[PDB]
Design an enzyme around this catalytic site. Structure first.
Site, short mmCIF file in Angstrom:
data_model
loop_
_atom_site.label_atom_id
_atom_site.label_comp_id
_atom_site.label_asym_id
_atom_site.label_seq_id
_atom_site.Cartn_x
_atom_site.Cartn_y
_atom_site.Cartn_z
N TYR A 78 -66.77 52.79 60.10
CA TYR A 78 -68.19 52.96 60.43
C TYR A 78 -68.89 54.20 59.86
O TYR A 78 -70.11 54.28 59.95
CB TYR A 78 -68.41 52.89 61.95
CG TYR A 78 -68.28 51.48 62.44
CD1 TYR A 78 -67.06 50.98 62.83
CD2 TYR A 78 -69.38 50.62 62.41
CE1 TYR A 78 -66.93 49.65 63.22
CE2 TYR A 78 -69.26 49.29 62.78
CZ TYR A 78 -68.03 48.83 63.21
OH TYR A 78 -67.93 47.50 63.56
N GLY B 43 -69.31 55.19 56.84
CA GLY B 43 -70.18 54.83 55.72
C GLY B 43 -71.45 54.18 56.23
O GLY B 43 -71.73 54.16 57.44
N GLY C 86 -73.55 51.49 57.71
CA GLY C 86 -73.16 50.39 58.58
C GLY C 86 -71.64 50.36 58.79
O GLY C 86 -70.97 51.42 58.91
N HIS D 85 -73.84 56.41 66.05
CA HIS D 85 -74.84 57.08 65.21
C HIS D 85 -75.61 56.06 64.38
O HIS D 85 -76.84 56.09 64.34
CB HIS D 85 -74.11 58.09 64.33
CG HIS D 85 -74.98 59.11 63.66
ND1 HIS D 85 -74.55 59.82 62.56
CD2 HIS D 85 -76.20 59.61 63.98
CE1 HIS D 85 -75.48 60.68 62.19
NE2 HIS D 85 -76.50 60.58 63.04
N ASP D 86 -74.88 55.15 63.74
CA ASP D 86 -75.47 54.02 63.03
C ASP D 86 -76.35 53.16 63.92
O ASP D 86 -77.46 52.79 63.52
CB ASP D 86 -74.37 53.14 62.44
CG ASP D 86 -73.72 53.73 61.20
OD1 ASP D 86 -74.09 54.83 60.73
OD2 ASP D 86 -72.81 53.05 60.67
N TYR E 222 -79.64 55.00 64.59
CA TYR E 222 -80.60 54.93 63.49
C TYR E 222 -81.19 53.51 63.35
O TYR E 222 -82.35 53.37 62.98
CB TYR E 222 -79.98 55.39 62.17
CG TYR E 222 -80.08 56.88 61.90
CD1 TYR E 222 -79.54 57.82 62.79
CD2 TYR E 222 -80.71 57.35 60.75
CE1 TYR E 222 -79.65 59.20 62.55
CE2 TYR E 222 -80.79 58.73 60.49
CZ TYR E 222 -80.27 59.64 61.39
OH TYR E 222 -80.35 60.98 61.08
N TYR F 171 -86.97 67.26 60.67
CA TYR F 171 -87.29 67.56 62.05
C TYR F 171 -86.85 68.99 62.27
O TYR F 171 -86.14 69.58 61.44
CB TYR F 171 -86.61 66.60 63.06
CG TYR F 171 -85.09 66.53 62.94
CD1 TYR F 171 -84.28 67.57 63.40
CD2 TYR F 171 -84.45 65.41 62.39
CE1 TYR F 171 -82.89 67.53 63.29
CE2 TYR F 171 -83.04 65.35 62.29
CZ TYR F 171 -82.27 66.41 62.73
OH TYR F 171 -80.90 66.42 62.64
N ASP G 13 -78.87 62.43 65.84
CA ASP G 13 -78.00 63.41 65.17
C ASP G 13 -77.29 64.34 66.17
O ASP G 13 -76.10 64.66 66.01
CB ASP G 13 -78.79 64.26 64.16
CG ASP G 13 -79.20 63.49 62.92
OD1 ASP G 13 -78.78 62.31 62.77
OD2 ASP G 13 -79.95 64.06 62.09
#
Length: 133
Positions: free
Chosen positions: A35, A37, A39, A55-56, A59, A80, A106
């Protein structure tokens, strides 16, 4: 497309240094397990990989916001503001809607990674073998 993951986006590169020592630790967190990478597929191989999946997913959820248009096209689309003292990471209240959302994705990832052992054997894992769905 470049196929860049959240872990190559510019501010993540900075934030990850709040908790992982070294000059360019972001590189360690790309293309690892199933995971880390762009997706992924299959079952996450370890705790660090689970952090990447989340995290994926974070996003992907961000993409529903209109001001998140272009997110992940390249590393430079969104910035940000944040501050940190180790794993005490604060996403600035002045961040706009998308900026705030990805800052929080993040932050959650950085905290998750601060607790996940780094298993070198899983860096560039053979996804064709280990990451089948």
């Amino acid at each position: 497309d470049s196929g860049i993951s959240p872990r190559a986006v510019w501010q993540f590169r900075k934030m990850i240094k709040c908790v992982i020592p070294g000059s360019d630790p972001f590189l360690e967190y790309n293309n690892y397990g199933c995971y880390c990478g762009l997706g992924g597929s299959g079952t996450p191989v370890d705790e660090l990989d689970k952090c990447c999946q989340t995290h994926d997913n974070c996003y992907d959820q961000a993409k529903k916001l209109d001001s998140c248009k272009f997110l992940l096209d390249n590393p430079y689309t969104h910035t940000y503001s944040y501050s940190c003292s180790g794993s005490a990471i604060t996403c600035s209240s002045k961040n706009k809607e998308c900026e705030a959302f990805i800052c929080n994705c993040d932050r959650n990832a950085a905290i998750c990674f601060s607790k996940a052992p780094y298993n070198k054997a899983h860096k560039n894992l053979d996804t064709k073998k280990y990451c089948q769905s």
